[PDB]
Write a structure and sequence with these properties.
part of a larger assembly, 3 chains, A mainly beta, B mainly beta, C mainly beta, A: mainly beta, 5-stranded antiparallel beta sheet, 4-stranded antiparallel beta sheet, 2 helices, elongated, C: mainly beta, Jelly Rolls, 9-stranded mixed beta sheet, binds a molecule of 2 linked components (NAG-NAG), binds 2-acetamido-2-deoxy-beta-D-glucopyranose, viral protein/immune system, SARS-CoV-2
Chain lengths: ~210, ~220, ~425
């Protein structure tokens, strides 16, 4: 699998040009299509075969494909061009779809994701189980991601992550849970939840007692 | 003018088989192809496979090889896809796109998609723990405490603070759906660090499909 | 799976002049500077070779004018093409180009040639669909754009390709390819030649013989043929229609063979370097009569002139006694079956046609001689026997039967020669 790597979020102020890069291996002997999916609808094809655009798509979407990256470019980004954009590569045998890219027409000031971390309560310790609780809030551009840490290493098992949800103030919130047996809870001297958001990162940490 | 109408919002159990239909109108059905695309809720698109409407001629992905069967019916001009041996991880939205009769591209019109949900929990009451205010949650003038209400199926559940008294800092986070099939959530509120144990902070948990009502006090760690 | 491609073009095909082209070695027998005259199917010199414009492109938004007709195959064809591309693949030969008749298919791809005699189901506009890989390498070539089904498959052959590209070509030169097809005595013979030429509008002025390629032992009845062209898939549209296939420019030359006499001048290595076609003009008939390429002054007897006669006038004498059969076939009272009559018809003019076509006879069988050839033969005597029998006893009046009639009433010898005539007579002979 030549699997295409594509960034999770691109933030653009109203009136600028957005550039989405679908980079996968090879990708020069394959044609690439670009699809647009608004939230709650079926996707819409916006670029079919390597800079070719169908009728009905306005004259600001332009594709490109050269080397090991494909590129979608929107010029003069309005508020209606806010959706998910998928990159797709086909050959004689199979078809690969890339990851998403949520584009956002910054209608406000980049907020800071307030993070808050909680260790497993005492009753849960007596309950022969353990759960770490990482809450994220107020981070208006919603492309947050999370990573979990035992004393020095990253962990990738026992964690669940909510998709971002819009609050009343029209910013976002999210949550993640870490499953642990209490003996593993006291095994490692401390854990932490880190969140990355627009390159920036903030992490919080808790140690057992 | 062209049109792909899908069918159903099926709910199955783990182990059963599902059949989705996609009916075309507005063009000559016999000279094109149909491809199927999956999308898990909150994830990206996956390619399932492709069929040509001329004479059979399937092409499946290797992840779904041996599980899916796609057929056509040009007399009524519909297309069917059948998945077998369903499990959790297969609950998704299934899309039907009009591809060419050859060369495996061009997912243009995208019929509206059917949501297929697998599972089986019925109903269950919540388990509650208090997440104590701690110095790791404390910072300067304020410190946060909350209540974790987990493992329940019947989605509408509510947690209030002090019978509805505190509205400052009280924030209930969206419930999360685990692999076990049960929901879970945690509601937290910040309160001045001078007031760790001083006043009353009791979370009132009410589960309306069931009849669960429990008040849990949150106090600083021992 | 096949496409309507044919756009109606008002323009007719042009005509060029085959100066001296399409000559081949009609046999495997090394010669060395021997001036040899041969009567065979050749293309006549300075004949009228049709220039077919196939796919051709005009630039307004890009319009291809597809017109690829089915042509007759009279006695063999001379085919010629100056194509830089690889747009001319093989041919289809046959009688109906359909089911219920066998057909022959020659296909050249980039590494082999494949020849099938089979029972095809060709479409109205057959072509070869080619697919590529975005690095312009080949992916697949579907022959299901030619036919829809191919069953009952008799002959198959596969070898090194007939036609190759050889691009580059020393800067600015063109590669003329010539083929001669002829199907005689159950064999299908193909002759070929490749020659480099410069930028000429037509066939060149030189001389080049054609070496034989294959002699396929088929036994196929061929009266029509058609040319296969290769089209590439466009990938800029999902549909399979005429907008979904791209094409270059294609043109070829077609002339027909005729039985002529050619004087061939061999080389010392075994190479036909020049030739001349007898007939045509007088000078050439003299060169053929002398067996030379230079005639010295003189006067030479070259042939003969014989007026031709039309129609055949057959004169003869009138007619009197055209036989009045109207006594034996028109009697008021016949004769019993146990004492039949016996009339000995004699010298006269007998017209068995008035009998044969009278349509009043329920049975008219002839044994020694079929009926229509009676009015063209002469004998010594005709006898006519007459009687009356039941209706279902007429099958015993025949050579070699049994029954109460043929046993002892009237017996016919076993090498009978005449004819037996019988008709119903219920109203005359049966009475209440
Ligand atoms: C060119 O033609 C030859 C002759 O048919 C093709 O070779 C055959 O390919 C098929 C599969 O495509 C095999 O099953 C046969 O065994 C092959 N026969 C021989 C004699 O090689 C060849 O694939 C064609 N090439 C292209 C690019 O179409
Ligand atoms: C190949 O040709 C043979 C005859 O040459 C076909 O056989 C005939 O089939 C029809 C119906 O299928 C019968 O009514 C005839 O009696 C058959 N002929 C004889 C001589 O028995 C055969 O069908 C052809 N092959 C295919 C695939 O159609
Ligand atoms: C080869 O096929 C052709 C078919 O055209 C035969 O030629 C005659 O074609 C006309 C046109 O349809 C028919 O009306 C005649 O009946 C055909 N002739 C005969 C004798 O049937 C031609 O005869 C065929 N050759 C052989 C050897 O069978
Ligand atoms: C016997 O004589 C009759 C009468 O002369 C012939 O009948 C004629 O047959 C022709 C052709 O069928 C009819 O056009 C006439 O109309 C018939 N005659 C009459 C008077 O109508 C009959 O052909 C004779 N039989 C033979 C064997 O010559
Ligand atoms: C064009 O194709 C259609 C089927 O696609 C067919 O019905 C029609 O007869 C074709 N046109 C001609 C002139 O044969
Ligand atoms: C070839 O035929 C066309 C008409 O069919 C005629 O005009 C032309 O003169 C002919 N060519 C020769 C060389 O006779
Ligand atoms: C492939 O060929 C087409 C047409 O001949 C040309 O436009 C294209 O640039 C070629 N691509 C490569 C990679 O050579
Ligand atoms: C062919 O003939 C030419 C002269 O016409 C001679 O020079 C040459 O040696 C011969 N043999 C070959 C080419 O093998």
């Amino acid at each position: 699998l030549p699997v295409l790597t594509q960034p999770p979020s691109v933030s653009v102020s109203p009136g600028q040009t957005a550039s989405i890069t679908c980079s996968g291996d090879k990708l020069g002997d394959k044609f690439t299509c670009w699809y647009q999916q608004k939230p709650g609808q079926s996707p819409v094809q916006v670029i079919y075969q390597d800079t070719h655009r169908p009728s009905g798509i306005p004259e600001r979407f332009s594709g490109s494909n050269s080397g090991n990256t494909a590129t979608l470019t929107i010029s003069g980004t309005q508020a209606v061009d806010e959706a998910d954009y998928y990159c797709q590569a086909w050959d004689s045998s199979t078809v690969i779809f890339g990851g998403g890219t949520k584009l956002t027409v910054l209608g406000q000031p980049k907020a800071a994701p307030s993070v808050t971390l909680f260790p497993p309560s005492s009753e849960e310790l007596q309950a022969n189980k353990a759960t770490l609780v990482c809450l994220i809030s107020d981070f208006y551009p919603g492309a947050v991601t999370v990573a979990w840490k035992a004393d020095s290493s990253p962990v990738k098992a026992g964690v669940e992550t909510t998709t971002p949800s819009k609050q009343s103030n029209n910013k976002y919130a999210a949550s993640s849970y870490l499953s642990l047996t209490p003996e593993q809870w006291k095994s490692h001297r401390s854990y932490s939840c880190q969140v990355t958001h627009e390159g920036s990162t903030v992490e919080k940490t808790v140690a057992p007692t | 003018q062209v049109q792909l109408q899908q069918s159903g919002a099926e709910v199955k159990k783990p182990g059963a088989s599902v059949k989705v239909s996609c009916k075309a109108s507005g063009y000559t059905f016999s000279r094109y192809g149909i491809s199927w695309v999956r999308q898990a809720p909150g994830q990206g698109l996956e390619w399932m496979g492709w069929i040509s409407a001329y004479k059979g001629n399937t092409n499946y992905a290797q992840k779904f090889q041996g599980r899916v069967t796609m057929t056509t019916d040009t007399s009524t001009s519909t297309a069917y896809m059948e998945l077998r041996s369903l499990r959790s991880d297969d609950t998704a939205v299934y899309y039907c796109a009009r591809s060419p009769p050859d060369f495996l591209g061009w997912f243009d019109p995208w019929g509206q998609g059917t949501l297929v949900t697998v599972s089986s929990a019925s109903t269950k009451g919540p388990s509650v723990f208090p997440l104590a205010p701690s110095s790791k949650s404390t910072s300067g003038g304020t410190a946060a405490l909350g209540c974790l209400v987990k493992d329940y199926f019947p989605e509408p559940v509510t947690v209030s603070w002090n019978s509805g008294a505190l509205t400052s800092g009280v924030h209930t986070f969206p419930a999360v759906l685990q692999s076990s099939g049960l929901y879970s959530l945690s509601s937290v509120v910040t309160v001045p660090s001078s007031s760790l144990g001083t006043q009353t902070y009791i979370c009132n948990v009410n589960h309306k499909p069931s009849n669960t009502k429990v008040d849990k006090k949150v106090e600083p760690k021992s | 799976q096949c496409v309507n491609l044919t756009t109606r073009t008002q323009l007719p095909p042009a005509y060029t002049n085959s100066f001296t082209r399409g000559v081949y070695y009609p046999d495997k027998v090394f010669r060395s500077s021997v001036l040899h005259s041969t009567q065979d199917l050749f293309l006549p010199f300075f004949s009228n070779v049709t220039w077919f414009h196939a796919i051709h492109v005009s630039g307004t938004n890009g319009t291809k004018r597809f017109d690829n007709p089915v042509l007759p195959f009279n006695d063999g064809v001379y085919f010629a093409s100056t194509e830089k591309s690889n747009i001319i693949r093989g041919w289809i030969f046959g009688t109906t180009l359909d089911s219920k008749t066998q057909s022959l298919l020659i296909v050249n791809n980039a590494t082999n040639v494949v020849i099938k005699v089979c029972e095809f189901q060709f479409c109205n506009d057959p072509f070869l669909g080619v697919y590529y890989h975005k690095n312009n390498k080949s992916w697949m070539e579907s022959e299901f754009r030619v036919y829809s089904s191919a069953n009952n498959c008799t002959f198959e052959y596969v070898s090194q390709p007939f036609l190759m590209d050889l691009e580059g070509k020393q800067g600015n030169f063109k590669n003329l390819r010539e083929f001669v097809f002829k199907n005689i005595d159950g064999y299908f013979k193909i002759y070929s030649k490749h020659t480099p030429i410069n930028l000429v509008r037509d066939l060149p002025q030189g001389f080049s013989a054609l070496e034989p390629l294959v002699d396929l032992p088929i036994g196929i009845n061929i009266t029509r043929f058609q040319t296969l062209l290769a089209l590439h898939r466009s990938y800029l549209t999902p549909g399979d229609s005429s907008s979904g296939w791209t094409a270059g420019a294609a043109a070829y030359y077609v002339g027909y063979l005729q039985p002529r006499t050619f004087l061939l001048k061999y080389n010392e290595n075994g190479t036909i370097t020049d030739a001349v076609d007898c007939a045509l003009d007088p000078l050439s008939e003299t060169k053929c009569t002398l067996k030379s390429f230079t005639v010295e002054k003189g006067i030479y007897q070259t042939s003969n002139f014989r007026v031709q006669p039309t129609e055949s006038i057959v004169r003869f004498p009138n007619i009197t006694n055209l036989c009045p059969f109207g006594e034996v076939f028109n009697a008021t009272r016949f004769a019993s079956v146990y004492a039949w009559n016996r009339k000995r018809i004699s010298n006269c003019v007998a017209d068995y046609s008035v009998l044969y076509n009278s349509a009043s006879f329920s049975t008219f069988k002839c044994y020694g001689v079929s009926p229509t050839k009676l009015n063209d033969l002469c004998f010594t005597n005709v006898y006519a026997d007459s009687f009356v029998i039941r209706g279902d006893e007429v099958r015993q009046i025949a050579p070699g039967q049994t029954g109460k009639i043929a046993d002892y009433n009237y017996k016919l010898p076993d090498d009978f020669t005449g004819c037996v005539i019988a008709w119903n007579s219920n109203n005359l002979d049966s009475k209440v």
